[PDB]
Point group: C3
């Protein structure tokens, strides 16, 4: 089984104990570590994003001297990068070719073992170009490998939303040219629903609305397989973060009315999002409810409501992905796990280690 772990560059800028650097990662935690995100220069070439990315690349590859089988990948794109730019590059043969050719020298220069594609998200007019890009990256990596080196890995972060998949992805085509698929099986329940909901339920709940039937881990996985992704290619995404809501009234059950995003956490400073280490604090004095159908916990206290992942639900999701014979787990993200052991004494990365243990 693969355990593919994302972490973010911007997590370094959080205050105090929230600041995350790659040298805080246990070298044997993950099989693959992905650095998010790289940019693309105006000359259409893969490049760093922050002024100091090189030094973090160095801190990341120094890990591989302590675990020589550890693989690192660089993720290009991300939400901030936007779809517009990828549409601009991929749909133009010269811009796309400049990028494809720019990828491998960069990765080798900084000691990376592969590229992760984070085009969030291709629209209908981009679908085929998306395919082409992947093919052309795969071809290029095939043409680039030499003796003494291992062929560059190619992965892609794909949406777990049915509509996004139908709109953007030619699944059967791209799955053949990707070493693995990072399935983003989380963040399923936006605040536009106007009710509380868990953002990463394993199965559908008691309700059977249009939005309810598709927005769960099981449907996304089975749908990806039905569309021609190989189970051996699929990595099931598991979040370390919770999605939160401010309650409109005393009702705090699943489906209760909300007045907006949850109050931001002290360190992540993003309304509606909580890192696991912020959730640990939140749980003191809170009610934890375990969803029978969805197999995941939410916790509530005062007018705050957060759906999240703990050790148990993470282990159960690993059991699910094993029954489905998936390639393993993908984790977003290490910097949102309790990486410093704040929650429990000397338990570093409790969620990711729980995933690793359940995979063994």
């Amino acid at each position: 089984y693969k355990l593919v772990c994302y972490f973010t560059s911007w997590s370094q800028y959080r205050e105090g104990v929230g600041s995350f650097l790659p040298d805080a990662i246990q070298p044997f935690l993950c099989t693959h570590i992905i650095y998010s995100f790289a940019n693309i220069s105006s000359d259409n070439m893969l490049s760093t994003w922050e002024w100091n990315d090189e030094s973090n690349y160095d801190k990341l590859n120094k890990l591989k001297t302590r675990n020589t089988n550890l693989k690192t990948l660089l993720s290009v794109g991300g939400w901030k990068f936007g779809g517009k730019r990828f549409s601009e590059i991929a749909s133009n043969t010269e811009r796309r070719t400049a990028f494809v050719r720019s990828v491998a020298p960069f990765l080798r220069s900084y000691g990376f073992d592969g590229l992760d594609l984070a085009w969030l998200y291709p629209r209908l007019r981009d679908k085929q170009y998306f395919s082409t890009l992947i093919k052309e990256l795969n071809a290029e990596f095939t043409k680039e490998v030499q003796p003494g080196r291992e062929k560059l890995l190619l992965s892609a972060a794909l949406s777990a939303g049915k509509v996004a998949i139908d709109t953007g992805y030619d699944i059967a085509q791209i799955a053949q040219h990707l070493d693995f698929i990072n399935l983003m099986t989380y963040d399923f329940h936006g605040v536009w629903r106007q009710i509380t909901g868990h953002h990463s339920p394993l199965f559908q709940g008691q309700k059977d609305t249009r939005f309810d039937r598709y927005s769960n881990v099981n449907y996304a996985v089975q749908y990806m397989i039905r569309l021609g992704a190989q189970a051996s290619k699929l990595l099931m995404g598991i979040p370390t973060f919770g999605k939160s809501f401010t309650l409109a009234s005393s009702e705090n059950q699943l489906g209760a009315p909300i007045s907006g995003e949850g109050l931001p956490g002290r360190f992540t400073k993003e309304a509606g999002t909580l890192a696991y280490y912020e959730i640990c604090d939140f749980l003191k004095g809170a009610e934890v409810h375990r969803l029978s159908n969805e197999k995941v916990p939410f916790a509530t206290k005062g007018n705050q409501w957060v759906g999240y992942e703990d050790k148990e639900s993470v282990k159960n999701k690993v059991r699910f992905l094993k029954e489905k014979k998936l390639a393993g787990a993908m984790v977003w993200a290490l910097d949102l796990d309790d990486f410093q052991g704040t929650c429990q004494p000397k338990e570093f990365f409790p969620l990711t280690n729980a995933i690793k243990d359940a995979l063994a």
Copy 2:
């Protein structure tokens, strides 16, 4: 009568059924269609904003082959663009001249019939420069007529807020050089009021302050006329969108207390704003109330409250603009109308078509 219809470039990026492209426009819906927004390059020259604006210019002008009387305009500026850049350009003779000269070749190259000025918004130090810019554009369009030409049209989006008008506009001066004025008679009630209010009331309601009397369609129209805008130049802005609030308590009347913006819609994803196609969804299970004085509806459901436009209120506003002998209606925006017939089986553009029918 003119029916001048705005649509936005960024509406193309909305998910699913929300994605809007100009080829979805019925060619006989509007007399004029305005593309928002164009940018200005660092060399002070009119330019595209998105990498693919050119292809949407094509989608838009190919409409004129199906309705040869249709006029298109390109709107430069917009809220994101900001006032600063316009202050920098307009107050400097060289930069302003570079822009002014750049406009006509650009518009002709892409098949546009005119330019719309969307300086949101000029402050006191800009007022005269604003005038100058308009004059110099008009002069240039006067100088540019050819054999197979119609003179380029020049319009401007002007605020309907009294203070913005007194601060930024020399109305009597600029009205002489503008073919029409797109009066932004909507978005009158910011969340700073701390109570619910309709964002486009036709007349003032029962409540009185100082800016209660000014913040309605009637006052803005009559004020623009009193300041020397010609009724034949004034287009009365009519919104296809609602402005929404989250209610602080069970009180849901006009003037009820709020805790913030309304919850965002699924497709528009902007707290406080709902497209008409999202409002149709919202009305299912909601109570609709029609304001007697203000002549417009608001709807309430749970802790959500939205003031909006429907067929009836839109028709009544057309009747109003006819009594005042205005040049016609301006619509913001086509992408916020139910352009795909989600509300009622293939009734495309119900609000805009209601306006068109009411002009006859």
Copy 3:
């Protein structure tokens, strides 16, 4: 002793609607001893530069004040929150880039008639601490090398956090205090919305403590802590805000520590949820209840589900009395554009809060 009244104002305040628009020529020339312009940028060539296209003309409106008060000092503040820490980390940690900046400072200031530089690195983290020190030292040295007959040495100040953790993380206080003419202590904005309860953002002292409110987040602790860490009282300026921090209440409970549903509703002119200028607070108080904290020595105001902790004349005067007892160099004010600079609150009372501070310093 003699006291400094150091007053910040912001460049972006000019862009606010209507009566909220602020330009430096609205400043009374004798209000303040020092006026600080926020913020300057740093060009990609690592050189001090303007931020807005029209900064030069506002520099002129600002120095035109000094002809009417010839003892008035102006400083240009570089950095700010929008500027971010990343850029300062990039510049300060590299000897070539840092030297280019240091050398660029003085010619710029002289070109535009400024009497000094204010450093607004918000905020240096642990790996930046020493580089921060070096930068300050190297600026001071450079200003020392730049003085000639007929001119007075450039002033060097720094905006420093009043938060304990930020201070421990970023600042070598005893070292940098020796190379700074004064420290602008940011003794405000103490209570972020992440607390999930109401709190005053600039309490003078700790209140009747429950576990939710820490010991550190008040003016007294920050001042005494800075002194304990080797800042000289004669170097410390105690920051006093003209703005309030606001919350939307989750329920009818409206006292200190009450539950909230988010930031306060934005003001009409400042347009920033959670923040209200004093002139917006004046309007807000109409129909509101004003509550005065006994221990914290500051007011909060309540109306409907809105809750705002702020400063009025009384609390500002009392804070000046406090800073005098501690023998501080004087007061720092953030910010003039957030004071009632046009006299909206009371007829012909321009800058009521800052003038209250000035009067109390005399």
